[PDB]
Ligand binder design. Sequence first.
Ligand SMILES: *[C@@](C)(CO)[C@](*)(O)[C@H](CC(C)C)NC(=O)[C@H](CCC(=O)N(C)C)NC(=O)[C@@H](NC(=O)CCCCC)C(C)C
Lengths: 244, 241, 204, 242, 233, 249, 212, 198
Amino acid sequence: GSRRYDSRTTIFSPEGRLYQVEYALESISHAGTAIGIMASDGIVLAAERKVTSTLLEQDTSTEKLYKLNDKIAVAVAGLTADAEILINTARIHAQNYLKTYNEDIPVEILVRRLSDIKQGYTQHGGLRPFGVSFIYAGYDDRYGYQLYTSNPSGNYTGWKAISVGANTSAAQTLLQMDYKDDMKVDDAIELALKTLSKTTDSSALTYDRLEFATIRKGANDGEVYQKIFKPQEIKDILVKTGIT
Amino acid sequence: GYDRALSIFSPDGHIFQVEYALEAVKRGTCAVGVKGKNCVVLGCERRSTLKLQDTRITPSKVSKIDSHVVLSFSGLNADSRILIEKARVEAQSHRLTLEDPVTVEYLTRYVAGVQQRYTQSGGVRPFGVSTLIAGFDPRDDEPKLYQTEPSGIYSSWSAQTIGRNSKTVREFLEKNYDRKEPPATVEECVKLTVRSLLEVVQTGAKNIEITVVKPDSDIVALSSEEINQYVTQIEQEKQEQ
Amino acid sequence: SDPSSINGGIVVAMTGKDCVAIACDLRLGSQSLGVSNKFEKIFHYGHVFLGITGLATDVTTLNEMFRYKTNLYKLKEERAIEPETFTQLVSSSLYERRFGPYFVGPVVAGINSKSGKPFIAGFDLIGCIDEAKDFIVSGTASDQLFGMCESLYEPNLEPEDLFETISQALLNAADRDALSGWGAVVYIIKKDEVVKRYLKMRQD
Amino acid sequence: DRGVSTFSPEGRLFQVEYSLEAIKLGSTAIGIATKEGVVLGVEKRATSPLLESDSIEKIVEIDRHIGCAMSGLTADARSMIEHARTAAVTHNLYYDEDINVESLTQSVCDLALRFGEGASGEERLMSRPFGVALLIAGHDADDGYQLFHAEPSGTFYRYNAKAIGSGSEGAQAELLNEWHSSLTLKEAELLVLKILKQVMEEKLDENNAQLSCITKQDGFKIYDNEKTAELIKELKEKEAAE
Amino acid sequence: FRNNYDGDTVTFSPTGRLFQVEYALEAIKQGSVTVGLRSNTHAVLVALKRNADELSSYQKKIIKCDEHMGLSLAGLAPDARVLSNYLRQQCNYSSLVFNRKLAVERAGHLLCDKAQKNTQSYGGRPYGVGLLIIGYDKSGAHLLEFQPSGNVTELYGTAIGARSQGAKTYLERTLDTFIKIDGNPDELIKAGVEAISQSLRDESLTVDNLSIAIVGKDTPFTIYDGEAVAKYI
Amino acid sequence: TDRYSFSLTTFSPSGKLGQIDYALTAVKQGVTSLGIKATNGVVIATEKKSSSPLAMSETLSKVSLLTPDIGAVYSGMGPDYRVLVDKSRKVAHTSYKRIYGEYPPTKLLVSEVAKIMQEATQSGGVRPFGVSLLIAGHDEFNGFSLYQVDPSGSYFPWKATAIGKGSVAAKTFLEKRWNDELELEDAIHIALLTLKESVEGEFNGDTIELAIIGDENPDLLGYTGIPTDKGPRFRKLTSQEINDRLEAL
Amino acid sequence: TTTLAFRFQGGIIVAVDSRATAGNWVASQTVKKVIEINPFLLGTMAGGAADCQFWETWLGSQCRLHELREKERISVAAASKILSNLVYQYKGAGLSMGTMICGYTRKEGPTIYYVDSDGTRLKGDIFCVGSGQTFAYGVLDSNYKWDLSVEDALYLGKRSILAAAHRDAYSGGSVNLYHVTEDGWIYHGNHDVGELFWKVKEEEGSFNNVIG
Amino acid sequence: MDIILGIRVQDSVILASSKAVTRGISVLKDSDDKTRQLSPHTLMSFAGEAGDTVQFAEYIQANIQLYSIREDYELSPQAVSSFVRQELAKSIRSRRPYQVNVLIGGYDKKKNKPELYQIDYLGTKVELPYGAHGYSGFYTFSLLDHHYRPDMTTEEGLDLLKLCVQELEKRMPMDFKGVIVKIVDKDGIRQVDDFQAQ
Ligand SMILES: *[C@@](C)(CO)[C@](*)(O)[C@H](CC(C)C)NC(=O)[C@H](CCC(=O)N(C)C)NC(=O)[C@@H](NC(=O)CCCCC)C(C)C
């Protein structure tokens, strides 16, 4: 029968490692780098697309940054195809929560549920795992600003600053060297650019290769605001830091 | 749909997938549990590999199953969330059909039963998790400590540890824990816990997390400040000699 | 017995020169018993305003539902729902429960953000779209409202004027209905701004 | 790979045979049947001294007249015991009588071959056989005191005496020579204690070994530690005598 | 060669053989010997029981299906429990719906058809047991042989199990004798005892070792064990 | 019965998804197709590679309409494209038109198609689709758009691109010629020239398939009456309409 | 039916009649309306005969299972809820049963639960259930003190049934008595109303409304 | 029906519940607590059909308790009330629908304000200063209209309740055997034991 062709995607190695989870994590370490830094007055998300073409459209494009919610957003590293399937449940889940409790979903409860969906493909069903790592950046009336990461294993953790994708080891050490707690948002904006600029496998770090977002609570509106930087805005902020 | 037998017997008589699930536990961070005269203490280690974390929101290693019973684990974190959840649901069901919170033995037996069930159902792999379940039975002031493992086997321990280097800490407890006279104080029982983890983890302010469960649903996790004081005293014990 | 007749409440919408107006009463009762003088019947999703009369649990549900559906829409489309389009989402949503309907009488009002065109629409409990240029009425005193509007209404009213006309329509209709009234609220809508006024009416 | 329920060229089921090898790794269990009662003994075998030995439940009550001793992968036995009790109590509900030991055993063994991968016949959802053997002891009106050995193969033999687990083959040649038809219950209790002592790795005491019996009068009892301690004391006195 | 064509019953060998079925047949040859034999009045089963120890019991080889039909087993005991049960329902159904004693020839066709479905579908292993079914329906006395391939054969007399070739040559030699044993059950049972000892080698058949069953015209299907078979030793 | 309830695309030690990598190889073997986006329109074009001089090229349409405002072209395996087009049309109704009474925006119908292809990457017992698609469309709120959809399920927006055989050399040709001030007539001119580098054989309206997303076509609607209905923006050019631009090329 | 159970100084008294009817036809005068769940647990029966008998025997089974499983005897709160929850699954199918579950556990002491097919479960000290509950309540309420002796408490229970047996047409036959203590239940006899009425009337002076 | 009253004042919500359980012609109990504690600062009372009444309440109780354990956090009164409403809104269009009218008395620890919620078996939720289910409303709603001020103390709130209870004992045909009264405030849930002859 079909027994012959079954890869057995949900088994342990003699070592006690999940083959498919490991090989999927290896896949992600090749995808474009994403960075999340959380400050005292907001959170920053940035990402780099792999290299692309001039012809490529940058205005309509939003491929690594996604809005999950009024107050939650995500950076993607891995297969976009896989990522959208999950992003769509994540959106449905938040709405379900809102329909039930008449309150916006707390950031962790959202993160946990996705990570539980991921864990599923790890334990039963004989299907392949989602080749996706997420950074989550959101706000709620309980913990305030939150930054999470989740990978194909279904494991999630909380961070002050984090990276997924390619060269995360190199990027983590650089953050671990320049990050401090009393940081302003616009200080964390600079850090994320510098970090990407130092791990870039390309010649130069240009606007057409970058995506940028902030989940900053307005210093006048006094409520939470999301902002996905449009090409022109990134072009402007890149001259400020000194990368032209 | 998918029912392929993943956990099966081998020529010599082993279920390889369960043995490999144990190996996942052996890789997990160290977890310890010791019971005193009037309490149970739970100790866990936190990795140093990546150090830009957020302990406010990162799940803690010790979780409440009910107001009176806690569960710690060693192994795959993602797998643990499934076990914890089922256990919490059964805690509520139990209060609802019996009008009484769960006994530690019962709750343990149900976590053990799930684990077993994944070792002889088609299409699933065993849980890469061993658990330590601790607490006090309703209206009872006798401390309880139980250990479960991927095979679904469970039993009670005066003291036990699981995870990486649990051999090192188990050897420590086997010579330091007296069954005749258990740790009489809450304070005395915390010291014995920290001392045992200090064999494995390297001078851990952040590296050791302690949770104390007392009779009648009195569960209170210890801060980095309090634990720090124990370690400060413990390392001064050696130098006097 | 009649679910449309247990809780009470009325809604009316009306168009003018570069403006729409939507209005409701605040009553939530159970037969003769007046229970809440606060129960509002208008909601908005971006610039699209919806009013619902009928069985109040269904009113409450359908609110939550259309918030759920517009939220997901705006995230996928990256733009706010438009009155014309929303109207269509309301119809298909109701007709989905054709043989077990929501006991409601929805009303849609707003201004197309692109074309600047004023827009109102009415529905029955199974999603039949009743599109009108002048006015739409709903609830336990729809008869009284139909007569009020058909008489008081004239086209191309100015924002200030329209307010007077719609309020006097609602008030006199609610005073001939035992299950409507107890307060009232009137939304005046312009392309740029929206103005919400509570009215002073009989409390019996 | 290969089918789970697949015959070897010799004519046996691969999964069943390997399962039998898992049982040889388990703790020793001994049953002896007499006209005064049936006796069940087990080795606790604690892996560490910190393990609380009386939480090793390798003897379980199935009904007031039927008891069970296990050997092998013991977590595998929970659901076999659950089935057993439900069979017993369910039989009592329909028939207002006590289930026959013979038929209770047969019920348990019916579960044993319900493994496969969506096979022909009747809905058998289980990915592997049980890795445990059972000794089922009891009493019914018709056939008196009985001891059954329940293999994961689905077959069940009746024994006058039976040992299962690590030291079973050595213990079996021992029980062969020792058992007679006119044994008293006290002689049987001491006989279980003697054989367990011989095959164990640890020195046998009231902590690492557990006794039980089933008689017509008091039904099925698990001996408390203080009771067995006094029988261990009594045995040592008698071996020293001759 | 054989290595690649024995993973499941769904696969044919290049020669045209089904190895999984053939290994199931081997389980019968390892089983304890049992024998059948009939005349026009009565059909008889004689079976040798196998024990594990001298402390264990001799596991039973004969099963009742209905008041006119039953069988003896050789091979896997659980598979005999499944198969005998089925025939018990098929006998039961014939009675309740048609007020009919299900004939032994159709008994075999039902066993043949049930066994066959296990040899063609993925996942399902063949049955691992052979059966000797004796009956007395509306057409006299019958005896059937069942192989887990599906092949059912109506015979006067036959044996299955270990060393069963000895008993089969005996019945082949004394055909003209035992078939004419009409009206005397005893001298048919005694003819079946002399058959099974042709397949003995090591042990002498004892009082808790022997198992005998009889059906016929004025006798219903019954089981003989213990001191009740003592006369035939 | 279907015993294939497990994934057929899995991860290899290196992090490659084998079946997808291979599906993409099949796309390079397929005939060249391209797409260009002007300020007031979009053009998609491909080559009709004929199986036999006896086959009628009209009966096989490599360019297809999905909605009145959305068109699709491909490189790779034809049969896989065909069944995708059937599903793409259906999904545009079930998941959108039957809900909102209007057609899905270009980006959302792409998104739906991507999903259908992604499931072929993960579901039990299926190989991925062996096609890359080019979707060209218009919607009131986005204007004109061009998207590329890979066997993995990924999608990228393009000012211009090609897929298949000579895609490498064709993308280089487009980079030279594309600007942000192009009219739709120019975009067609470039498209014909870019396709000329791929084609060895006959180059006419008989062996070249081309369609546009331009102005509303009132005379292609089929009815007059509703003022808010102005006709489809998808237009497939005829054999004759192509030859008209090839006479002065 | 008439049945009662109440709680006092020295445990629980349980008393029931023994009559079953099909309309106005007296079907039986010797029905056992008390199920003995175990040495410490009792259940009473009122309403549909089969519904009570069947499910309360099923209850007995469910309790034995709890013992085997948890190595401990089931609490009165719990045992009542096994029945209460079963009965609620069927709510609307037309089950008809008013039940009382009385027993002793160390955790709870003396405990009585009322359970009906409406799916109502109530804890209390005094309950009367069935066609003739009101007639029992009259005599029971008017003579109840917490500090009754076991002898007096048993009598009052017996007397309360008799009152109802007399007036209620759908009650009678004979009285069955029980006493629940720390050590479990004690059966206190089967008293035929035919002989009891004339014994009580004579010895007590009551029932002066009757000729004789 | 049973009596179920609630009143919100300045710093607390007060709930009053009929003590009687009556089946047919007999009062079976005169001391029934028609309430469940959902969380340390949220209390729910209930009246309706014989069986559905407790079964619904205990079901809502399990879910909120499971939530609190899972999140180590207490839901706001607004959030709990919404959850309940939806459970009943789900119920109404099912095979055999829950027949229960509830009041939610909560103190939002985050907002430092008391909250009261009336929800009928239809899932008709409304926030109120004072609330009543069933026939009880026909007497209390007009009494409270007259005597209620939003700045009242918990003490003034209890006087106002006794006055509602006296009116029901006087005019309503049922003997409901008095009320069990509970206070929900910043310190949790406590029971006013001596309401009998206060
Ligand atoms: C009192 C005698 C008052 O009825 C008790 O409640 C008594 C209970 C004990 C446990 C028997 N109940 C009966 O005797 C019932 C009363 C039936 C009933 O609930 N009524 C409608 C009045 N009688 C029966 O259960 C009788 N069976 C039936 O009526 C069922 C047959 C109908 C199916 C076609 C039998 C005892 C004769």
